[PDB]
Amino acid sequence: LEEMMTACQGVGGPGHKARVLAEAMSQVTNSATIMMQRGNFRNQRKIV
């Protein structure tokens, strides 16, 4: 058995847990992008 995929699933290596992270960090950082945006909008469309 090519148990590389079995290992790289969370039990040994992340491999997919790395993809779950990638999903979440994109989303968490995006959620903070909404905070930046919640400033770079309010202030903006003025005298800028």
Curated annotation (Swiss-Prot):
Q: Where is this site: Cleavage?
A: 21-22, 35-36
PTM entry text: Gag-Pol polyprotein: Specific enzymatic cleavages by the viral protease yield mature proteins. Capsid protein p24 is phosphorylated possibly by host MAPK1; this phosphorylation is necessary for Pin1-mediated virion uncoating.
Tell me the superkingdom of the source: Viruses
- Positions carrying Asymmetric dimethylarginine are 45
Q: What more does the entry say? A: HIV-1 lineages are divided in three main groups, M (for Major), O (for Outlier), and N (for New, or Non-M, Non-O). The vast majority of strains found worldwide belong to the group M. Group O seems to be endemic to and largely confined to Cameroon and neighboring countries in West Central Africa, where these viruses represent a small minority of HIV-1 strains. The group N is represented by a limited number of isolates from Cameroonian persons. The group M is further subdivided in 9 clades or subtypes (A to D, F to H, J and K).
Family to which the UniProt record says this protein belongs = Belongs to the primate lentivirus group gag polyprotein family.
Entry domain remark:
Late-budding domains (L domains) are short sequence motifs essential for viral particle budding. They recruit proteins of the host ESCRT machinery (Endosomal Sorting Complex Required for Transport) or ESCRT-associated proteins. p6-gag contains two L domains: a PTAP/PSAP motif, which interacts with the UEV domain of TSG101 and a LYPX(n)L motif which interacts with PDCD6IP/AIP1.
Could you identify this protein by its name? Gag polyprotein
Query: Which organism encodes this protein?
Result: Human immunodeficiency virus type 1 group M subtype B (isolate LW123) (HIV-1)
Query: What gene makes this protein?
Result: gag
